[PDB]
């Protein structure tokens, strides 16, 4: 129940004795959905963040961090595809995802999906810079569930499928069946990337997603890092899975630098490209 | 019973950890120095702080220390002579000594107290402060630069919390120096002046490579690597790592990473372009 000039504390009993905190300087939204508890605040005007938004307690986006984790999972994917026209995201209900996609010339159409219709709303009221994407006429903005969505998909529909969800522990956890309707719906030189958890928190469930990605089927699987500060231990990831065999994820297949937006983005370029698939020696087997 | 960090210059932000123990806790002739048993169903281990900000945790250490380490060391073309300033846990030094060709490591914290400190309570990093190959002094590394000869060292790390000259001139022709970098969410104009200021002071490049710290704050840091050397590329290295014997035994770093480390998001790319 937060207060301006209160603290919004972020604490996870699966990670015991590690909180982070900032303080609020004005209340947005803060109320159960259908489906989570959803958190908009302002954050203290002397730091950087701007507005946050959180679900079931946990940081989703804040204005001075979002382009990260929005252009990696967004680029990454569709500089490792020849063409992609067509794009699905999943869950992506704040927009920033779908903004850079919709970057490209070469994408005619996305599909969004999001199962809570309340994050679409209050992004577009309180996040425009994120948001704008949603009205998009090359966007369709769906609110549903992403697992039921892809089943009843025809195979053979998608270029490129994104996967921005919240954790295992809440309403995404069966986009952690599914799997294989992804791989189904993917046309043959389709990009699958998804929300890839931590390689300090979560380094185990990152194992085990990419060797089942590749049994489902996928031909190749590479973790791709990424600094986030306001996520848990400063680090996020994304499996970037190839349909196809014989693709290199790894080397970016179209480098932004000859599209004409490559100026406008904030993080990534094909060097990030590159840098992101090398990770630490203690995790370097995901990627081998 | 938390340990809470906030930091004055970054105002509405704080990160805490569970302290399941106070080991030490008391000001120092320098700064305060805090080592606390934290959580034991969290990864973190043993925590040193110094005035307020973590500086070691056992379970991340190994990135910062190997990244000054073998980043600096891998960068140059034989390091037999080195000089760490600061670096009173003993980590960086650890690093340093794993390569075959150092002689001769000399490491001048200002702080004894930490000397003291990591041996009691972390002897994974410290141990290294015991080795034949080093030399410890307790003192100030600002006289210590000052009273050394021209051309005594292949490599000087700055692992802290007139100089910068004196740090070129007791670096050989072909000397590398790294330091503590600063972190380009919340630190971003300091990194640029900073390598501005040591270019001018002469240096011939200076590269700032980033870095993965959970328990930094906002979760990275950087080094600047600085060639005294000009026509020097520190981003790719001259001494690999894998062509060494003790490469599997690092963490953290090796040749990918040490790359990797030097492309920078678009935001922050003008600190190296
Ligand atoms: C906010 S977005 C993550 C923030 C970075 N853009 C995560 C979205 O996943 C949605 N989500 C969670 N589960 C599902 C399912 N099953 N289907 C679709 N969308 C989902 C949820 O409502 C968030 O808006
Ligand atoms: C703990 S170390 C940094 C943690 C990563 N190993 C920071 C050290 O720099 C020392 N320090 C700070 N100022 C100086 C000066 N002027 N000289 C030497 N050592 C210094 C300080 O006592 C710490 O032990
Ligand atoms: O990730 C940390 O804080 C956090 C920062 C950001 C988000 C978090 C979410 C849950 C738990 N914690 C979070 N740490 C780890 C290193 C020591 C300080 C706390």
């Not at 959803?38 to 203290?44: K, R």
């Not at 679409?120 to 609110?143: C, G, Y």
């Not at 994104?162 to 995404?172: H, N, Q, Y």
């Not at 990337?193 to 590479?222: H, P, Y």
């Amino acid at each position: 129940e937060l207060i301006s000039g209160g603290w919004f504390r972020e604490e996870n009993d699966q990670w015991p004795g590690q909180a982070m905190s900032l303080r609020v300087e004005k209340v947005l939204y803060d109320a159960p959905t259908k489906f989570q508890h959803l958190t908009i605040f302002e954050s203290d005007p002397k730091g950087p963040w701007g507005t946050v938004m959180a679900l079931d307690g946990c940081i989703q986006v804040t204005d001075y961090d979002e382009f990260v984790y929005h252009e990696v999972l967004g680029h990454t994917s569709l500089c490792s595809h020849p063409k992609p026209e067509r794009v699905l995201i999943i869950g992506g209900g704040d927009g920033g995802v779908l903004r850079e996609v919709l970057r490209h010339g070469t994408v005619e159409h996305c599909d969004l999906v999001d199962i809570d219709g309340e994050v679409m709303e209050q992004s577009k009221q309180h996040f425009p810079q994120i948001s704008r994407s949603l009205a998009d006429p090359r966007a369709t903005v769906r609110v549903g569930d992403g697992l039921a969505f892809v089943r009843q998909t025809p195979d053979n529909t998608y270029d490129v499928v994104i996967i921005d969800t919240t954790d295992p522990a809440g309403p995404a956890s069966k986009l952690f069946a599914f799997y294989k309707d992804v791989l189904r719906i993917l046309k043959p030189d389709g990009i699958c990337c998804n929300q890839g958890e931590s390689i300090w928190l979560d380094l185990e469930l990152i194992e085990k997603m990419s060797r089942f990605i590749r049994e489902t089927g996928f031909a190749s699987v590479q973790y791709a890092l990424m600094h986030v500060p306001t996520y848990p231990c400063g680090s996020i990831g994304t499996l970037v899975c190839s349909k196809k065999a014989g693709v290199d994820v790894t080397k970016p297949l179209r480098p932004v630098e000859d599209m004409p937006f490559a100026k406008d983005l904030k993080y990534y370029d094909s060097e990030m490209h590159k840098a992101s698939f090398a990770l630490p020696r203690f995790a370097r087997h995901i990627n081998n």
